[PDB]
Design a protein. Structure first.
Lengths: 236, 142
């Protein structure tokens, strides 16, 4: 079983410190780049930090620079996040995610850990449809992100961790139905669901690497509602 | 330049062992990958590499020096990827093998310097964005 499991979350006071751990199983950890992605309650995904296989290349989001330190111990299959000078703005579920070497997609995600301290790509906030209908979700970027690099799409069902839906603009991983499709044109990208199903009611996020920011940029997310959907698509 | 030094160490140590025929932290993992991917490219492109070596006509020290100068314009079509980089290094290993058979083993180090010079000079920005040698390892992981 290929898995990631985050640890170390909890309640901390502003100005405090907390260390997160991420335990990797079922794969050769030392051959993959790893990332931390967080999500404030009721809000979108925000990339935090990334570290290459041998720790030679490290990157941070502007909002955590100087306060957060990412590290890894390949001998323990572990990824760490040292968080100092914690602010209320850092409250979020923190996810550990594995990056594919050939595509840079985040193919494996942990369940997340809650830290309680007490958008460069754009997407419509909502989208809706009846079952069987075709819906489209756009993702707007610019020269240094979508215009220079590939786009990835993630799907997050309510109460679940995000899952890889599309990679390299239009490629589907195993386990993703052919009803989902993606496209990239200029600095824009789009996700199409051809024949809405009950299970498609989820939040959808686009993401791309930004050459100017040297950061991963996530879209604000689109909440997809399936009006009049039946449990497991069985209409009685 | 930590990237040129690291790349030179990786490419030279790989070309020197390919000629000799015997195997000698981030650089350690990159070398293991280059040994697997590189030997594979040389095995599957042996006929194409034989034609390229015959065309270049390498018989002495000066022929390696001329190859060194023509090297800066190898990626003139604007196509950049890890496949193209490993193809240059693998062809360099193939020319390093030939150099050992023509009793010109001293030519392996300037050949390694020229391959490294072109990669770091014309592709530095690309290599840096690709996480350099960590990126190389992660790209070819199976």
């Amino acid at each position: 079983q290929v898995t990631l499991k985050e640890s170390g979350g909890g309640l901390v006071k502003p100005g405090g410190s907390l260390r997160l751990s991420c335990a990797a199983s079922g794969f050769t950890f030392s051959s993959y780049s790893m990332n931390w992605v967080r999500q404030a309650p009721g809000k979108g995904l925000e990339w935090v930090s990334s570290i290459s296989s041998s720790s030679s290349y490290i990157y941070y989001a502007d909002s955590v620079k100087g306060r957060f330190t990412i590290s890894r111990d390949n001998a323990k299959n572990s990824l760490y996040l040292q968080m100092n000078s914690l602010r209320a703005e850092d409250t979020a579920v923190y996810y550990c995610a594995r990056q594919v070497g050939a595509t840079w997609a985040f193919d494996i995600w942990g369940q997340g850990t809650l830290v309680t301290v007490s958008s460069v790509l754009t997407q419509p906030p909502s989208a809706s449809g009846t079952p069987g209908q075709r819906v489209t979700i756009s993702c707007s970027g610019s020269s240094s992100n979508i215009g220079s690099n590939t786009v990835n799409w993630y799907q997050q069902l309510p109460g679940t961790a995000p899952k890889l839906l599309i990679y390299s603009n239009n490629q589907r991983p195993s386990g993703v139905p052919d009803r989902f499709s993606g496209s990239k044109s200029g600095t824009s990208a789009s996700l199409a669901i051809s024949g809405l199903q009950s299970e498609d009611e989820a939040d959808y996020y686009c993401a791309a690497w930004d050459d100017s920011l040297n950061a991963w940029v996530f879209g604000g997310g689109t909440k997809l509602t399936v009006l009049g959907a039946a449990a497991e698509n069985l209409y009685f | 330049d930590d990237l040129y030094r690291q790349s030179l160490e990786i490419i030279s140590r790989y070309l020197r062992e390919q000629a000799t025929g015997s195997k000698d932290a981030a650089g350690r993992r990159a070398l293991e990958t280059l040994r697997r991917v590189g030997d594979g490219v040389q095995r599957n492109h042996e006929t194409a590499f034989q034609g390229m070596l015959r065309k270049l006509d390498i018989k002495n020290e000066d022929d390696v020096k001329s190859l060194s100068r023509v090297m800066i314009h190898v990626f003139s079509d604007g196509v950049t990827n890890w496949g193209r980089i490993v193809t240059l290094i693998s062809f360099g290993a193939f020319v390093a093998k030939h150099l050992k058979t023509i009793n010109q083993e001293s030519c392996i180090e300037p050949l390694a310097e020229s391959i490294t010079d072109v990669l770091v000079r014309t592709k530095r920005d690309w290599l840096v964005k690709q996480r350099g040698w960590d990126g190389f390892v992660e790209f070819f992981h199976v």
